[PDB]
């Protein structure tokens, strides 16, 4: 909880500027997860 030599703040920052290149653009990422278990499933959404 102090700033000085041998002390480093953990939260850096992105400088997301449109003038940047493709390599430094920002990306919105979303990630899903699925698993198989005992009790009968609920999230179905099958065919038509």
């Amino acid at each position, epitope marked *: 909880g102090v*700033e000085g030599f041998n002390c480093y*703040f953990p*939260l850096q*920052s992105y400088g997301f500027q449109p003038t940047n290149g493709v390599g430094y653009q920002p990306y919105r990422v979303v990630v899903l997860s699925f698993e198989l278990l005992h009790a009968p499933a609920t999230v179905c959404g099958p065919k038509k």
Partner: antibody
Amino acid sequence: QVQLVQSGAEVKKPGASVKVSCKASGYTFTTYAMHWVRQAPGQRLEWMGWINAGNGNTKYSQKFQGRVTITRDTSASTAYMELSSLRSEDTAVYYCAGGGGRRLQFDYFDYWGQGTLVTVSS
Amino acid sequence: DIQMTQSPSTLSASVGDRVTITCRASQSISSWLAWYQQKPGKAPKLLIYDASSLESGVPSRFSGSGSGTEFTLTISSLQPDDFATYYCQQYNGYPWTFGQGTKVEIKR
């Protein structure tokens, strides 16, 4: 409820410098966002800059570049503003704003100081 | 820099009515905006952010809308506490600007 309070009235003279400051009272300091804005009387509001009450970051305006400075004191939980080379225009009312809380930064002012009056006269 | 102008310099009304405000931008804004209420001789109070969201602790009357450039605020019933100016803030880019001021009155 978060509240912000700050100094009283000031009067100065051309060429001088003035130091206004506002004290914070927030439930947590999750990279708090004291964030200054000013208003010439009967005019459009004008935005000063934002200090990163988390650590030290100091993004400033551009019309006011190179003459205004901002700091803060961690223990007192206050925010410090400083302006030099004043002139008759900057006669205004000065405001503290900021205080996101849920997320760490915004750019909209949701907790406003009750106002500081500055008069540049000769 | 981004320019912000408000279409109504002043707005007339009477108690228990609806009003609308227009905030136009010189350039495209991706629904980044907020609406502040400022009574005379006080400090600004925020109402709407991100052009849609309703910030807590306010009456439910207030409501934002709009996207792109033309942006709109609207209240259903006009209560006494609505008698003051209203500003629009852009925050699409750097140096963040403000509107002009849109002030209501009490018609008689």
